[PDB]
């Protein structure tokens, strides 16, 4: 994340840290969200290159990347489901959404705690009004050209950008569509970045925190007229329910 602040997972207990195994401790691969005690939602493009589930481990309750967090829960991935109509067109990912069924080494899934909670899915086709504050979090770099990672969870606030603006020529134009949503800071000072993909965009809907977006893509990071682009979760509830449901 560019801008925003270092934060504890208590502020974002649904954040799932997804690591990829090496041949050599696992490397942080991308973010995710705990939508069910046994199910985590992340971005499909995180996994399209090496889609075998054994390549990945999932940690819940992590404020610190690649070190031990008290309260941490470690999970193997028993099901790794990528959206079957996923595609990459231009710089955009379409149907960028993935499901991760998680289980501990003893066969359990997430146990609710201060640092580990589920996030509510939105109602069908329902988003917050455009211009609404939504939070984004993750282990991503603090600028696109930074060599280092902050190694520590970051959280920030962006505003929903209407499809009508976002599809304007000096914004994305037609390389976005209606099953994506844009989010940006009014003066372009904060945004999701390198390492944030798969992570949650949380809006307030019907008086509850709601997974509204999944960090997908965007041109450059916190750049004028170039909002962050997120998988619009409210259009994937049937697909989600066809699996976990």
């Amino acid at each position, epitope marked *: 994340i560019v801008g925003g602040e270092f934060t504890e997972v208590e502020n974002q207990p649904w954040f799932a840290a997804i690591y990829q195994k090496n041949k050599s401790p696992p490397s942080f691969k991308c973010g995710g969200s705990l939508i069910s005690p046994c199910w985590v939602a992340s971005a499909a493009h995180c996994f399209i290159q090496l889609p075998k589930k054994e390549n990945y481990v999932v940690y819940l309750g992590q404020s610190k990347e690649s070190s031990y967090n008290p309260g941490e829960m470690k999970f193997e991935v028993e099901q790794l489901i990528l959206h079957e109509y996923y595609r990459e067109d231009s710089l955009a990912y379409h149907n960028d959404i993935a499901l991760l069924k998680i289980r501990t080494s003893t066969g359990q899934c997430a146990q609710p705690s201060r640092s580990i909670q589920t996030i509510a899915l939105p109602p069908r086709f329902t988003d917050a009004p455009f211009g609404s504050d939504c939070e984004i979090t993750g282990f991503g*770099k603090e*600028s696109e*050209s930074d*060599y280092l990672y902050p190694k520590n969870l970051k959280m920030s606030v962006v505003k929903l950008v209407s499809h009508e603006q976002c599809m304007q020529p000096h914004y994305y134009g037609s390389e976005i569509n209606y099953k994506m949503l844009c989010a940006a800071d009014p003066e372009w000072k904060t945004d999701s970045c390198k390492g944030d993909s798969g992570g949650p965009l949380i809006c307030n809907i019907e008086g509850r925190p709601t997974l509204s977006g999944i960090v997908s*893509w*965007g*041109r*450059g*990071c916190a750049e004028k007229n170039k909002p962050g682009v997120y998988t619009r979760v409210s259009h994937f509830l049937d697909w989600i329910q066809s699996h976990i449901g």
Partner: nanobody, 116 residues
Framework: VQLQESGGGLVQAGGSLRLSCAASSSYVMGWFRQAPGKEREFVAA????????NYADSVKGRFTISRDNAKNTVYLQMNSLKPEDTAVYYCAADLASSRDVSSWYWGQGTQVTVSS
């Protein structure tokens, strides 16, 4: 893929040198180096628009990284060089998307030697 460096060589301390790298864009471009007895370290990086730039602390204020998106070229301007800067310099490309963890690709490198 194939990033090719050029411009290296022997310079006396306090002198200047300009490294060029040709790529064969949308990615972050950068420069790394490998000093004697050490593994490869980060030197500089720059996003596609020049909007974000970044340097290692040891080269701050006397190295300047630039970019030409027309010719797919990236440059490293090295001023006020010291014996500490003797290394094999590798231009690099971050071939990951703007929301993905960085995945660096390196050239074959070019020798830079600074006298004293």
């Amino acid at each position: 893929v194939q990033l090719q460096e050029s411009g290296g060589g022997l310079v006396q301390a306090g002198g200047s040198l300009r490294l060029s790298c040709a790529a064969s864009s949308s990615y972050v471009m950068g420069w790394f180096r490998q000093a004697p007895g050490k593994e490869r370290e980060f030197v500089a990086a720059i996003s596609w628009s020049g909007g974000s730039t970044n340097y290692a602390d040891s080269v701050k204020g006397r190295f300047t990284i630039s970019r030409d998106n027309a010719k797919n070229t990236v440059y490293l301007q090295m001023n006020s060089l010291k014996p500490e800067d003797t290394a094999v310099y590798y231009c690099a490309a971050d071939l990951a998307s703007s929301r993905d963890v960085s995945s660096w690709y390196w050239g074959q490198g070019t020798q830079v030697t600074v006298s004293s």
